[PDB]
Subunit: 275 residues, 4 copies
């Protein structure tokens, strides 16, 4: 059956209702949804009181999962990450990032389930790498197309906040590596900016002051409201996004209330650039 | 009768339904609403198919109106400003500003009516001057409390875009003047940042490079998502805000579709700072 | 006879003694000097108690002169500009600029004569556009090579500081125009950065935030000490420079003492870029 | 006998001749010199073909010496540091720093001896913390007076450039610590800026974006030419400076030529602020 899809902007975002998440999706609906997650870069679904297991299953429909090397997992589902924030574990996601770009093959998508929410706050926003690229002048597209930038797990997971033995672990297992500044989408083939303030440390193909100037420019550029969507969470909301051409930011303005979110993280392939 | 008020965040924003705008508000509802516009800094109401006259009336319940010296007005209601954007008149409000801070006595509030909308886009966001102030470190509050900054109608209404005779008019009638960087709310008495990128040119109480550094800092600070609310417009939506402790930004991402918004602008008193 | 030429750095600057400025230079010495002004971008000569007339003559050996539309001239020599600074006329040259880049055909050189000096201070420095270009990464050279930037006499000669009738004059006679960001030297053929904070307002071939980011980068880059020379003035010192591949800055740290400098300004041809 | 002292600017720098460094200084000359190093913040002496031992002796006249935990020392004089730069050891001092501010009690002075020089280049400049402070607007002086900033040996001696065992050594022995942003001179009692890009990581008494904005401002401010002096080195030149109210920068523009400089480093007391 036809899914109802309501775009939330000209670029990024859409809201859908057609699924009973509780129930496996009919091949047919899965490819309406799959295609919606690509056309819009994020999609929101409401009233989906799923379990971790059921969430992991739906993620798998997209591809193999990735296990976070730091974050805690659900009960007996190590593929679904638990984000339980509160005073004893303050939220660290109020910063524009793309998930896990510190691995060779950063995730193609993730599925967020709103399990337990505070009165208000906790909004999460997404910014389009496609729309930001399209917003660059040609000479800037030509400048950035082909540069490579270093991503460092350590920039968003510093030593001092950690255990220190299990942190070192994840470090030696995740050294800084390079991804293209401008990423060509493996499916749509659309060009998109692919740096993120959370993990991108420097554009290695220019001088240091040069990199510094380009990144300050870029870490502000992706911040333009036109490039975004903002979601006001509600319990059992589901969020699904294309992590290869977006960044997102999760507001830290609800403490000391508690907030619980489950995430399924889907492995992607190796980001590249083509002309 | 009790108005239903739903907060959209811990700081700024709320949505209300209780009014039949078509109809004058009962003293009682007007002061629930009035108080809502103060507690939250912006409030949104839906399904309010009012006319310009009816909008002007509701504005008057708040205070005397101000007439814009540039923008066109409605039919036979010069107090309600018309914003009809499209290819022949591209939108100029995609920039964080506070309305009319280029006058001695910048408006205390405005009422926006969504008359004609495009498929999507056109979102308008608001940022809290109160929340941004509270987010500054003490030494920064002490640094900014007491400084004065110059506001220049010309910064957001440059000559080249204009008529040139009626532009000069509005210029000689609106010279650059000073307002406090930190404004004390005339009613709540709450402290709030009061510079805006649209009209603030320089903090006159420091050196030039100093002002420049503080403003770059401030024009980015107020941009923090936690300080904001974002509204996805729908026809006959009404927006009402406290223009003395907020800024707002209206997305330019709908051309060549047309978009029509009516505004009532309410005169405020003279901004001040107190400790 | 052979001129003694002492380089003051690997890039920019040199000091020479061989001339009796009082006396016209022998074709032969003029082309040692001419070539020195090109190899080094600035050259300094000491103990040259020349007159305005004698200075104008030497300038002419380089080419036609240009008359400044604002600055006062010498006695009966309108080609030599007088810079008499003091409390009643505070110095405005403490800012990195290239002289008269607000005309189509900005000067190829200038000759500065130190007529009357204060106890200390008043140092003037020069920065190499060649060395700064060579310091850019390749992708940056490729980005900047071919862009054009607007120069505006008004940016360094604002209305408020002025007469207002003779200022308007010079404005209508000198509208903003474009020069290449990277200039190819008409003689050496060397590539050099060619923006200057004094007159460059925006790089017109990119977006506004983009231009803004590149110029902030560039207005700081040319500031790197390696790219420069600093001259501690002495009475009857002569300074001669290649204004097409340098910028300079004159310290404002001698008031209320008086300081008098004479300048001859030599017209250049039209700046271009080639590969 | 009276030393000849020639100021090189209104603020910072002076050149002196009166000493036969080879020979111990007469109490009387030492206090002319001592006082010159304080009035001017740096002093330069030429034609002083001293040995390391003789240099260490002169340093001692100022106070106890400090031994660098990284840099190599002279023959049998561990108090005098050797800076032998060339292709196999490229220069790392082309960056504005104050020496050893990563210890509780950063040096009050240092004495630099130019042992072996390249054809040109290698200029070293000094910037006045006093003049930079005096250049801040009052509200900025009030903002910065009393803040504290963290200094980190690691910022200018990163792991990757190192041995790694002797580097760790110097790290565990030199953890990040705090100094006042505005330092009161222990003798003159003059107020001076006391952050340096080489070691200052963050102003701990404000927010992170705030610190970041103040430091970007400060790391550029101290760069104003008026605040400085630039020395063109000559063999057997001696440089002596007050490391508690200055920063300096040593040009990296002479490779592959070799350059040898000896330094004596004098321990200071604990920096403080007073009003
Ligand atoms: O907590 C949220 O709303 C999103 C957190 C986040 O960035 C993530 O799960 O990747
Ligand atoms: O058009 C909008 O959505 C708001 C425009 C604006 O800034 C205003 O009416 O003040
Ligand atoms: O006064 C000086 O030392 C130089 C002033 C200047 O910029 C000029 O004459 O072009
Ligand atoms: O090598 C120089 O000229 C100075 C190097 C430096 O910063 C130092 O010795 O402290
Ligand atoms: Fe995330
Ligand atoms: Fe507005
Ligand atoms: Fe000049
Ligand atoms: Fe040093």
């Amino acid at each position: 059956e036809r899914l109802s899809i309501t775009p939330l902007g000209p670029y990024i975002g859409a809201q859908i209702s057609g699924a009973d998440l509780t129930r496996p999706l009919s091949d047919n609906q899965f490819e309406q949804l799959y295609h919606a997650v690509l056309r819009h870069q994020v999609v929101f679904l409401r009233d989906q009181a799923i379990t971790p297991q059921q969430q992991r299953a739906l993620a798998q429909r997209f591809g193999e999962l990735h296990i976070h090397p730091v974050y805690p997992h659900a009960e007996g589902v190590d593929e679904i990450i638990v984000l339980d924030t509160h005073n004893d574990n303050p939220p660290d996601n109020d910063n524009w990032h793309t998930d896990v770009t510190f691995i060779e093959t950063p995730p193609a998508g993730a599925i967020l389930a709103a399990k337990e929410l505070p009165s208000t706050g906790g909004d999460t926003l997404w910014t389009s790498g496609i729309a930001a690229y399209e917003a660059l002048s040609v000479p800037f597209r030509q400048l950035l197309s082909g540069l490579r930038a270093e991503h460092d797990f350590r920039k968003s997971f510093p030593e001092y906040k950690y255990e220190h033995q299990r942190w070192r672990e994840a470090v030696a297992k995740n050294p800084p590596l390079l991804h293209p500044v401008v990423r060509t989408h493996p499916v749509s083939g659309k060009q998109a900016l692919f740096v993120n303030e959370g993990f991108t440390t420097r554009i290695v193909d220019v001088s240091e002051k040069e990199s510094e100037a380009l990144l300050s420019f870029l870490f502000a550029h992706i911040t333009k409201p036109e490039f975004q969507v903002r979601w006001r969470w509600q319990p059992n909301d589901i969020a699904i996004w294309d992590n290869r051409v977006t960044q997102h930011y999760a507001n830290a303005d609800y403490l000391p209330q508690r907030r619980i979110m489950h995430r399924a993280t889907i492995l992607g392939d190796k980001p590249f650039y083509r002309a």
